[PDB]
Amino acid sequence: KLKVAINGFGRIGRNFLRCWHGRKDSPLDVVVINDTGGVKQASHLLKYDSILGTFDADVKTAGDSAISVDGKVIKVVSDRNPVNLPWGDMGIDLVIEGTGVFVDRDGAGKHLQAGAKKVLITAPGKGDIPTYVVGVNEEGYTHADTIISNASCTTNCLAPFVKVLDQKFGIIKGTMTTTHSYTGDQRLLDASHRDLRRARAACLNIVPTSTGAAKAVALVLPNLKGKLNGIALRVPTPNVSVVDLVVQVSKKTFAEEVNAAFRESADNELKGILSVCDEPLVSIDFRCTDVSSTIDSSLTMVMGDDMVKVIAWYDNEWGYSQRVVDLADIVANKWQX
Amino acid sequence: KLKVAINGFGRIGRNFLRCWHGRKDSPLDVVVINDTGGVKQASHLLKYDSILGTFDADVKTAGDSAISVDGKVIKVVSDRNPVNLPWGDMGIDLVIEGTGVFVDRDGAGKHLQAGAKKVLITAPGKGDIPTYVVGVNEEGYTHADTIISNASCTTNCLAPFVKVLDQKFGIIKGTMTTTHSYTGDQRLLDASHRDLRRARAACLNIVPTSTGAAKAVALVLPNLKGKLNGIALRVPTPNVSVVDLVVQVSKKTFAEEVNAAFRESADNELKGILSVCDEPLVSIDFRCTDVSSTIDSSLTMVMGDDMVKVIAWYDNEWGYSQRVVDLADIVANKWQX
Amino acid sequence: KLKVAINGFGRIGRNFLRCWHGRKDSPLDVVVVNDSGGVKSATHLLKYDSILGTFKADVKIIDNETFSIDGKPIKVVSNRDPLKLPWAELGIDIVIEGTGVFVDGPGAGKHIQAGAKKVIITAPAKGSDIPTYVVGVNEKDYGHDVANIISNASCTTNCLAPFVKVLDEELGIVKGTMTTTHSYTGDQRLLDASHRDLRRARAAALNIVPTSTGAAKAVSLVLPQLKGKLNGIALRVPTPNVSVVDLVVNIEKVGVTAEDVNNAFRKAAAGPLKGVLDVCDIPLVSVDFRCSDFSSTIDSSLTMVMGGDMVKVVAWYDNEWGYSQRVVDLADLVANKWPGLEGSVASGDPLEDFCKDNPADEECKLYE
Amino acid sequence: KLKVAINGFGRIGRNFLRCWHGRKDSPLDVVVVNDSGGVKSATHLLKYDSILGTFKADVKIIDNETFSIDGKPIKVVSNRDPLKLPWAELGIDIVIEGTGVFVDGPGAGKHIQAGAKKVIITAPAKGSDIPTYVVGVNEKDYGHDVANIISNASCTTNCLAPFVKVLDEELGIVKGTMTTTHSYTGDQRLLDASHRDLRRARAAALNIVPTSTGAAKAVSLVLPQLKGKLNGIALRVPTPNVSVVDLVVNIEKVGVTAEDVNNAFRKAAAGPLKGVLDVCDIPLVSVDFRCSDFSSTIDSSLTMVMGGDMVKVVAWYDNEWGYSQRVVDLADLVANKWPG
Amino acid sequence: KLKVAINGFGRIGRNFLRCWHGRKDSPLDVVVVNDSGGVKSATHLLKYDSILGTFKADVKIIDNETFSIDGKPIKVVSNRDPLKLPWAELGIDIVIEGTGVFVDGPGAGKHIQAGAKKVIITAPAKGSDIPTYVVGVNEKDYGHDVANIISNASCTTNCLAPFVKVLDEELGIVKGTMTTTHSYTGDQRLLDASHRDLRRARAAALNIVPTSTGAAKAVSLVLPQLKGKLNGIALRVPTPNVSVVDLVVNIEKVGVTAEDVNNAFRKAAAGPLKGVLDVCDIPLVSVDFRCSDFSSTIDSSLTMVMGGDMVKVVAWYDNEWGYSQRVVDLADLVANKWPGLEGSVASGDPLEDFCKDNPADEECKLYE
C-alpha cells in the first residue's frame, strides 16, 4: 500500500528492492522506482547482484518503466529533478533517495514537491533531517514525520548495539568507527574527488572517513553524543563490513558481559536487527545477512574492564537495505502520516 | 662481513634481501641464503616483486646457490633441518629465519647447531627469545645475545612510536592492534588451517588475530605491558598496513600533541625507523617505505584528551625487512658477539 | 548410499559436499571424510564455504573426527596415505580425489585396496590408467569393474569435453586455439610461490598468469579426434570460483556464422548436453554465470567469427561449481553402474563369473 | 617546447606526465591541465599515482589553477569542454585529451578552436579528422600538419598495431582474431548500474568483462592492411594498468612454428620496434608488464603455432603508463615534425 | 637388479627366465618367483622346455620356496593375488604378469602396492589404459616409472608393433583384416571343454580352431595410424610354440609388392628393428622360425602382393622365444630406463624433487 519509489535505483536502490522482495510483511507499494540510468538496465542489474548472484526472485519489466518482478509491477523512470521524479506521478507515500545526492532536507522536500508525502533518506539525517536508525529511534519514530532518514549502514550497524553498550553498561568515552565497505561513493581509479583519500582507486584503498556514523550516533542516541563519537573507515571491502570501536564503559564490563548484553538485546531490541556471532570468520559467510550488524561478540574484548574493543559484522549493503525495508514498513505499518 | 643466510628465502626472505641490497652500510655478508624452494626460482622471485616490480638490483642465479644481483655472490640452498641449513656450511655470524617455522628458540639454536653463531628471528621472540623491535630495545640490544628476534612488522611498527605515546605522554590503557596485511601465513583459499579464520581465502578476508604484536609490545616495552596490550588484525591488504589503537594516555594529550611527540621522536628515536605523514591516502603511496611505520599523525585523533585513535601506516613487508636489515647491521655493526 | 571417504576435505571436496548432500537424492551418500583438517574445519569450510558462503544446511559436528551434514553422518579421518584409510575400515565403496597427491593410477588404487572399488579424480591424472570420463561424451564408458581409477576432466576440460563434443561432432574444428580464464587454484600461492614453474610460481591472484594448460590436449581419453583441432591455455585469474573457456577454431564448414554454431549448441544443449552445456547470449559478467550447473555456458553474444572458419566459441564455466555439478552427475551415473549395479547371471554365465575368480577352470581359457 | 595541457587530469594524463618527466627528448613543456579537480587533485593523483606510485618528482603546488612541477609551472583549468580550456590563451600546441571523451571530430576540434594547433587523444577517436595515430605503425603515417587533431587509440591498439604489422610482414595475417586482456575500462563503473553502458553496466572489476572494444578494429585503420583482419574482444580484466593482446590466425604463411615467428619478432621487437615490441621470454606476469614502456611485450615464452595456420602471439603492454609512453612517443614525434 | 617376483612361472614364465638368465646384460635378475610351480618342479619346468628342451643351464634346487639357476638364488612363492606378494617383502621392482589373469591395471598395481614399482602383462592387458611395449617401438613411452603398469604385446602384437612401425610408416595401411596363425597356449583347450568360451573351449590343440583377435586394434595403444586399418584373427594352430602373422591389408602408398615391402623391412630390421624384426626369404618352415629371438622372422619369398593394395607379409616367429627375448630387452630397456634421473643437484629442482613428492610443498603447490 505504501506508494514508494526509490530515487536512483543503483546498487543501494537495487539492494533495497532485493531486500523488500525477499522481505515479507510488505505494505510497501513498491510499484515504482527511479533510475535515470537504464531502467531496462535497472531491471537487469537488479536481476543480477553478487550479494545474491542473480535477483532473489524473477524480475519482469512490465514496461520500459513498469517492472513486474514476480508479477509485482514496479515503475522506474529516468528522472533527475526531485520535483519531477515519480513521486506525485503516482502519489508516493514514502520517498526513498538511493542516489545520495538528494540526501538533504532540500532534496527530500523536492521529492515531496513532485507530489509525494513522506521521505526516507538512505543516508542518515543530512543535517536538518531526523535520522532514524533501525534499532534506537525508528521505534521512537512515529511515522508522522515526513522527511526521515534511516541512519547509514554504519549507524544502522552501530546505534542499536552501541546503545546496548552505553545503556546496559554506560560509556564514558568511545572513538566510534566503522570499517565500512568502500562503495560507489568513491573514485574507481585514482580519479578526482572532493576527498583526495576517496580519490584513489578505492578498491583496495583504505578510506578513514566520517560518514553519517559520527553525526547519527549523536543524533539518534543522546546517550552516545560526543563522548561516544569518532570517525568512519570506508575500508576496501565490497561486502559486509565491521564496526571498529574501543569504548571505555562507565560501568566496567568484561568481554562476556558485553557479549551477554548484546545477546539479550538481540533478544529484545536487536533481534533480526542484529545478530550475535562468535566465530573467527569473514564476510564471505556474513554476506547477505538481514541484520543491521552481525555482532562478532567473540572478540569484543574488554581490558581494564572498560576498553571494549567491539567487533561486529554488519551488512553495510544488504542488511542495511533490509533495515531500510524495516523502516519503510514502520512507515507503511504504523502509518501515522 | 656478517655471515648471514636467510632460512626460507620466501617473500619475507626476498624482501629482506631487497632491503639489504637497497640498503647501504652493509657489513652484512649476504653471501648465503636458504630456500628449500627453487633456489633458481628464489633468484627469479627475488628478481621480481610487486613492491619493487622487478628486483631493485639485477642478476640471473650466479649458477644457482651463489647469486650476485649486480652486487655480491649469495649462496642459497634447498635445506630444511636447521642443524643442516647453510649456517656452519660457511660459519654464519647471524641467522635469519624467514620461514616462520623455526621462529622458536629451538629452531634458532638448531640454526646455530648447523654451525652458526647468532640468530635473528624474523618473528618476535617466540616465547623464550629476546624480542628486539627496531625503535625500542634493539638499541638496548647489545649484540652479545645470540638468538634475538626483530619484533614483527606489527611490533616493528608499533613499539617505537607507541613508546613515544606511552613515554612522552604515558598511557593508562590501550587496546593495541595492527591492521596487518594478510600474508602467506594464511590459507589462499578456504582451506584447512589451525586458525579457522586464517582458513578462509584470506585475500579479501579479515583476520583479527594476535601475532607477535601483543606479546612483543609487553616484552620490548615494560611501559607497554598488559595495560597497553591487545590483539592484531591481519587485514585483507597485501601492502603497507596500518596500526589501529585508541590508547587512554595517562598524561592527557591532544591530537596535535600526539603528532608533535611522534614528529620529534621521528627526529630522535624514530627517524628512518618511522615517518610522520599527514595525508588522506593509502598504501599505494605508502608502499615500499623503509620506515617501520609511516605515522599517519593526521588522524591520530584525541577525544577526552586520552582517547588517541592512532593512525600510522607501516611497511609490514618492505620497511619491516628494512628495519630487519637495521637490526642485522646492529649485529654486524656493534658486533658484540 | 554410495559412500566416499572424500580424499582431502579440499575445495572440490566441499564442492561435491555442498552439491552431494545438496543433491538431496544423491546415490552418493558420503558417510566419512578422508582429511587431516578436523571436523571443525570440515564445517567451517563446508558449513562455511566462500562461493555459497555459510552452508545453507546443517553440518552437525558429531565430534572432532565425526559430523553429520543435516544429520548425514560423515566422519573425518585425520589420515593421508590411502592404504590406511577407511574405505575398508568403513566399507566405503567410492573415493573422489580431492587432494592432488594420490592422483596416480595405483595411488588412487590405494583407495581401492583400502576398501574402495573405483576412484574419480577431479583433475587430469598421471596417465591413461586414469581414463577420465565427462558428463556428455564418454561418461557412459562406465560400468562397475570398468576403469576403477578414472577422473573428471579439469575445470576447463570439464567445461570443454561436452561442448567441444557439440562443436567437433557437427561444427568440427579443423584446428583450434583455446584460451580460458582459470581461478587461482593450488597451482599457485597467494604470494610468490617458489613453485616449479616461474610462470605460476608467481602469486596466484595477483597478476593474470597465462597458464599454458594442455588439459585441452587430453582429448585422447574423451575426444581424441580434436587433437590438431585445439591448442588450450588457461588464464590463472584473481577470482575465487567462476570462469570461462574460449576457443577460436577454423571450422571444416569454413564460414560458420556463430549463429549456426550456437544453434547446434542449443540443439545438443537442449539435447544430450543439458545441465553441462548452456548457450547464453545475454551480455553478462561472471557472477551471472557463477554457480551455473552447465559446465559450458556458450556466451553466444561473445561468440563471433574471425575468418568464417574461425568461429569463436565462449562458454563460461563456474569451474569449481561446474565441478560440484559434474562430479555429482558423473559419480551418480557411475553409482548406478557402480557395485550398485552388482547382480548375478545364468548357470553357463554366473559360473563364468566364478571364472572371473577361477580363471583356469573347465574351458575358461581364451585369448593369449 | 610543445605546450602541454591535459584535458582533465587523466589516469592517462598523469601517466603521460610521469612519462614525459621520465622522458628526456620530450619537447612536451607541461604548462597547463584541464583538471576539474584542482591542484590538490592533480597533485595527489600525479604526486600520488599507483602505477608509478608516489610521483618521482615534485609537483610544485603553485596556485590551484597554475602550479609547477620541478620548476615546470603548469596551469590548471579546472574546467571541461575542450573550448573551456583556452588552448590559445595557454597556447597549447598539443592538447593532451586526458578525458578521452571528446574523441570525436568536433570534440578535440574544440581543443583546437580554443587555440590548440594539434591534439592527441587517449582513445580510438570517434572523429575522422582525428586519426588514432598509433605508435609503431601510423605515427609515421602522420605527415606533420596532416589532420592536426590526431588521436591515439587505446594501448590495446598501441600494442597490436606495431606487432600486427610485424606479423603481417614476417608471418602474414589472413584473419587474426584477438582477445586483449585489457584493463576494466573507464566505460564501466566499479559497481553495477554503471550507466547505459550496455554490458559493462555491471561492475567494472568484480568479474572479467569480455567486451569487444573499438580498439580491436582501431588497429584496422592504423594498419590499412589489417582490414577485418582483427575481430577482437577486450576482456576488460579486473586489473588496473596491464594487459596482453593475443593473436590467433589461419596465418598467411604455412604457420612456421612460433619459434621463428618470435625470432622475426625479436628482430623486430629489438630492431624496428624496440621500446615498442618486447619479446618477453622470461616467465613473468603483469607486474613486469606493469610500467612496461613497451608498446608491446610479446610473451614469446607462450606464443604458439599449433596447426601451422593456427598461430598465437602473446603481446603484453602496460595499458595506461605504457600507453602514456605511447602517447609520449606520438607527442615527441609530432613535436619533431611540428612547424618549429 | 630388476628382479621380478615373476607373476606366474609358466610357459612364457620359464621362456623369459631361460632367456633373461641366458641373457648376460639383463638387469632383470629375478630373485623370487610368484607361481604355484614349486622349486622341485619350478626348476624342472624351467629346467625342461620342449622349444629349448632341457634348459641350457643348471637350475639348482635351493629350498622349496627357493632355487638357483646354475647358482642364481631365486625365491619361489606359490601366491596368486599381487597384493599378497613379496614385491615389498623382497623389495621387487619389475613385475611380469605370467599369470595371464592380472591384466587389470589396478590389479597389476596390486604388485606395486605390494612393494613393486612396475608391471608387465605378458599378453594383451585389460584394455587401452595400458600402452603396451614390444622391443622396437615405444618402450621409451615408459620413462622411469612412466606407465608402471604396462604389457608386453601378444604373439600377433608382439610381432606387430615393430614391423607395423616399419610397415604402416613405409608401406602404409589403409584398412584390412589381419590373419595370424598361432600356437595353442595355456589359455586354450587341448580337448573340447566348456566354462566361458566356445572357440578356444573347443579342442584348440587338436584342430585349427578359428580364433579371432581384436589385439590388431591394440595398436591403438602404440601406433594410432593403424587404428581402423586392421582387425585380426589368431588361428589357433595345434603346433607347440610358433606363430606367424600376415597383414592382409590394402596399402595407400602405391600398393607395392611384398618385395620392396621386405626390402624396407630388411632395412628397418637392420635399422631400428633388429633382434625383433627379421625378414628372411629362404623357403622355410616353422622350426626355421622357432627359437627366433625376433617376434617377426618374415619369409620374403612367401610374402607376396597380388591386389597391389592387399599386402601380405608372413612375419613368422617363435611365438614365445620371440616373446621371451622381447620381455628380456623390453624389461631391460626399462631396467636401464629405471632410476637414471641425472642429479640436477642445483637445489633448484630439489624443490621440484620434493615437489614430485610434496606437490603442495612449503612452496611448490600445483593442482589444488
Ligand SMILES: NC(=O)c1ccc[n+]([C@@H]2O[C@H](COP(=O)([O-])OP(=O)(O)OC[C@H]3O[C@@H](n4cnc5c(N)ncnc54)[C@H](O)[C@@H]3O)[C@@H](O)[C@H]2O)c1
Ligand atoms: N554505501 C553504503 O554502505 C551506505 C552507507 C551510507 C549511506 N548509504 C546510502 O546509499 C547511497 C549510496 O550512494 P550510491 O551511489 O551507492 O547509491 P546507489 O547504489 O543506489 O546508486 C545510485 C544510482 O542512482 C542513479 N541516479 C543518480 N541521480 C539520480 C536521479 N536523480 N534520479 C534517478 N537516478 C539517479 C545514479 O546513476 C547511481 O548509479 C546513498 O543514497 C546513501 O544515502 C549507503
Ligand SMILES: NC(=O)c1ccc[n+]([C@@H]2O[C@H](COP(=O)([O-])OP(=O)(O)OC[C@H]3O[C@@H](n4cnc5c(N)ncnc54)[C@H](O)[C@@H]3O)[C@@H](O)[C@H]2O)c1
Ligand atoms: N608477514 C609479515 O608482515 C610479518 C609479520 C610477522 C612476522 N613475519 C616473519 O615473516 C615470516 C612470514 O612467513 P612467510 O612464510 O611469509 O615467510 P617468507 O615469505 O619468507 O616465505 C618462507 C618460505 O621459505 C620456504 N621454507 C620453508 N621452510 C624452509 C626451510 N627450512 N629451509 C629453506 N626454506 C624454507 C617456504 O617454501 C616458504 O615459501 C615469518 O618468518 C615471520 O617470522 C613477517
Ligand SMILES: NC(=O)c1ccc[n+]([C@@H]2O[C@H](COP(=O)([O-])OP(=O)(O)OC[C@H]3O[C@@H](n4cnc5c(N)ncnc54)[C@H](O)[C@@H]3O)[C@@H](O)[C@H]2O)c1
Ligand atoms: N576445488 C575444486 O573444485 C577444483 C579446482 C581446481 C583443481 N581441482 C583439482 O582437484 C584436486 C583437489 O582439489 P581441491 O579443491 O580439493 O583443492 P584443495 O586445495 O582445496 O584441496 C587440498 C586438500 O587435500 C587434502 N590432502 C592433501 N594431501 C592429502 C593426502 N595425502 N591424503 C588425504 N588428503 C590430502 C588437504 O587436507 C586439503 O584439504 C586437485 O588435484 C586439483 O587439481 C579441484
Ligand SMILES: NC(=O)c1ccc[n+]([C@@H]2O[C@H](COP(=O)([O-])OP(=O)(O)OC[C@H]3O[C@@H](n4cnc5c(N)ncnc54)[C@H](O)[C@@H]3O)[C@@H](O)[C@H]2O)c1
Ligand atoms: N587512460 C588510458 O590509459 C586510456 C586507455 C584506454 C581508454 N582510455 C579512454 O579514456 C577515457 C577515460 O577513462 P580512463 O579510465 O582511461 O581514464 P583517463 O586517464 O583516460 O581519463 C580520465 C580523466 O578524464 C577526465 N575527464 C573526463 N571527461 C572530461 C571532460 N569533460 N573535461 C575534462 N576532463 C575530463 C577526468 O577528470 C579523469 O581524470 C575512457 O573513455 C577510455 O575510453 C584511456
Ligand SMILES: NC(=O)c1ccc[n+]([C@@H]2O[C@H](COP(=O)([O-])OP(=O)(O)OC[C@H]3O[C@@H](n4cnc5c(N)ncnc54)[C@H](O)[C@@H]3O)[C@@H](O)[C@H]2O)c1
Ligand atoms: N605363455 C605365453 O607366452 C602366453 C602368451 C600370452 C599370454 N599368456 C597367458 O599366460 C597364461 C598361461 O599360459 P602359458 O601356459 O603360456 O603359461 P605362462 O608362462 O604364460 O604362465 C603360466 C603360469 O602362470 C601361473 N599363474 C596363473 N595364475 C596365477 C596367479 N594368479 N598368480 C601367480 N601365478 C599364476 C601358473 O602357475 C603357470 O605356471 C594364460 O592365461 C595366458 O593368458 C600366455
